[PDB]
């Protein structure tokens, strides 16, 4: 256990260390209000989803990344 650089117990350590990563600029925007719950209904409780096997229904966040949105659309 011979790797040590910073003093133990320094206050801001982990937050200061963390690189600043910028929030991605979104093409267009996220609809506010009713329209959003429309969007949700569509991608979640809509007829086609219901028609599929309820035990095989796919969980809402399964994809973090876009490669599986490409695998989902195919």
Partner 1 sequence: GKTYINTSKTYSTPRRPYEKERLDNEMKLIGTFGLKNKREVWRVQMILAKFRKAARELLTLDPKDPRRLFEGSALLRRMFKYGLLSEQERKLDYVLGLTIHKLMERRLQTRVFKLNLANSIHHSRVLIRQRHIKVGKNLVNVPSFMVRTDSEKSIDFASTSPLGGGREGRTKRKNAKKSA
Partner 2 sequence: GVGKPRGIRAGRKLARHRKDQRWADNDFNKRLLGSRWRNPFMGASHAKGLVTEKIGIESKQPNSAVRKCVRVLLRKNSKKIAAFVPMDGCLNFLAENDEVLVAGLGRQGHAVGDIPGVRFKVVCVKGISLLALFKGKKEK
Determine which helix (DSSP H) or strand (DSSP E) holds 14, and give its type and residue range: helix 13-17
Site for partner 1 in 29-68 (CB under 8 A): 33-38, 40-41, 44-46
Is 65 within 8 Å of 59 (Cβ atoms)?
A: no
Cβ proximity to partner 2: between 13 and 37 the closer is 13
26 binds partner 2 (CB under 8 A): no
> CB of residue 11 vs partner 2: minimum separation in angstroms?
5
Q: What is the distance between the alpha carbons of residues 42 and 49, in angstroms, rounded to a whole number?
A: 9
Residues that bind partner 2 (CB under 8 A): 8-9, 11-16
């Amino acid at each position: 256990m011979g790797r040590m650089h910073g003093t133990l117990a320094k206050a801001g350590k982990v937050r200061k260390q963390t690189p600043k990563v910028e929030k991605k600029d979104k093409p267009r925007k996220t609809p506010k209000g009713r329209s959003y719950k429309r969007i949700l209904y569509n991608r979640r409780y809509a007829p086609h989803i219901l028609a599929t096997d309820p035990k095989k229904r796919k969980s809402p966040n399964w994809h973090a990344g876009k490669k599986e949105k490409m695998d989902a659309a195919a």
